[PDB]
Amino acid sequence: DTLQQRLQALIESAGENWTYAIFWQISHDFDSSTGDNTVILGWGDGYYKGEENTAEQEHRKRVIRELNSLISGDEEVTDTEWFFLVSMTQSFVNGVGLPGESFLNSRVIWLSGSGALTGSGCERAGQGQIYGLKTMVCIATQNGVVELGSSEVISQSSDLMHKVNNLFN
């Protein structure tokens, strides 16, 4: 039932070797100046597997808590472990980047191979590539976006769309 458990069930649910899964969670920001309400994607939770305003305040405190828990806690910090850490404080206006684009258009965005990551023009895909990712997939769901990443080239997953649906819709 927890985001973290669903994320975990998602990637240990066999198939290919995904390095991590993240859930980017919808929140809303009211801009008094414009009278606009903007959807913003922010860290919901994540599971790192490895290789082989009251809402605003709750969100920031939960992330700070999650950063604390992850860091504390003296050995090597790997490229993909770093990317995972670095992702926790990232956020995305709706329409912006791979997560914003997934959500805004109810898309799956599936990027398979280094060339796809840098080629997409998403700064986050680009960032992940720098850190040794070769596949990134973002799947819009009811309350945000599931992102899976792998240092392997993965261009197919039989079950993926079905599991994501059961676990997040």
Residues interacting with Ca ion, by CB under 5 A?
4, 45, 79
Smallest gap, in angstroms, from Cβ of residue 45 to Ca ion? Answer: 5
* Cβ 111 vs Cβ 136: under 8 Å: yes
Q: Would you call 109 helix, strand, or coil by DSSP?
A: strand
CB of 30 to Ca ion, least distance (A): 28
| Nearer to Ca ion among residue 43 and residue 101 (C-beta) | 43
Nearer residue to Ca ion within complex by CB, 47 or 92: 47
Strand order in the sheet with 91-93: 91-93, 36-48, 20-31, 144-150, 135-141, 108-112
Provide, rounded to whole angstroms, the least separation between the CB of residue 35 and Ca ion: 35
Q: Is 138 in contact with 122 (CB distance < 8 Å)?
A: no
Using the minimum distance from each CB to Ca ion, give the nearer residue, 51 or 79. Answer: 79
Extract the tokens encoding 99. Answer: 């997560």
Nearer to Ca ion, 28 or 65 (CB): 65
What string of DSSP letters covers 124-143? Answer: HHHHHHHTT--EEEEEEETT
Least Å from the CB of residue 47 to Ca ion: 7
CB 148, min distance to Ca ion, A:
16
Determine the residue with CB nearest Ca ion: 4
Q: How does 95-111 read in b/e, with b if 16+ C-beta sit within 10 Å?
A: ebbbbbbbbbeeeebbb
Closer Cβ to Ca ion, 45 or 101, answer by number:
45
